[PDB]
């Protein structure tokens, strides 16, 4: 019984965690362009 039942665990562990890989990448990479915008706005301040 535990052949296919455990075989499904591999695909579950891969896909269900690749799911939130994209979530963490979204949470992190969005916090990068805000700094660029802040820097360019400070540059506009200095002129």
């Amino acid at each position: 019984q535990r052949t296919g039942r455990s075989a499904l665990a591999v695909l579950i562990r891969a896909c269900y965690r690749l799911q939130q890989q994209l979530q963490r990448t979204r949470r992190a990479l969005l916090h990068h362009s805000d700094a660029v915008l802040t820097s360019l706005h400070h540059v506009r301040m200095l002129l």
Partner: protein, 80 residues
């Protein structure tokens, strides 16, 4: 033996220059509290500051191709 003519160094000695009618009212004797020189200096300093800051921003933001490849390629390998 050293000889020369002498003229007395008197306190009564005064010098008499002459002034033209258009002397005192030169435009630069009378100046306001705010002229263009101070703004020029401050504006040039600000321009140099912004020139430095844009370069700093350029070197601070030059990681986008690296900040995206290292986020996308490992997921490609994981799926592949």
């Amino acid at each position: 033996w050293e000889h020369r003519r002498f003229i007395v160094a008197d306190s009564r000695n005064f010098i008499t220059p002459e002034f033209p009618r258009d002397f005192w009212m030169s435009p630069v004797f009378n100046l306001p509290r705010e002229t263009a020189a101070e703004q020029v200096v401050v504006l040039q300093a600000q321009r140099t500051a912004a020139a430095a800051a844009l370069e700093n921003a350029a070197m601070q933001a030059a990681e986008l191709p690296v900040d995206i490849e290292r986020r996308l390629r490992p997921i490609e390998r994981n799926v592949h």
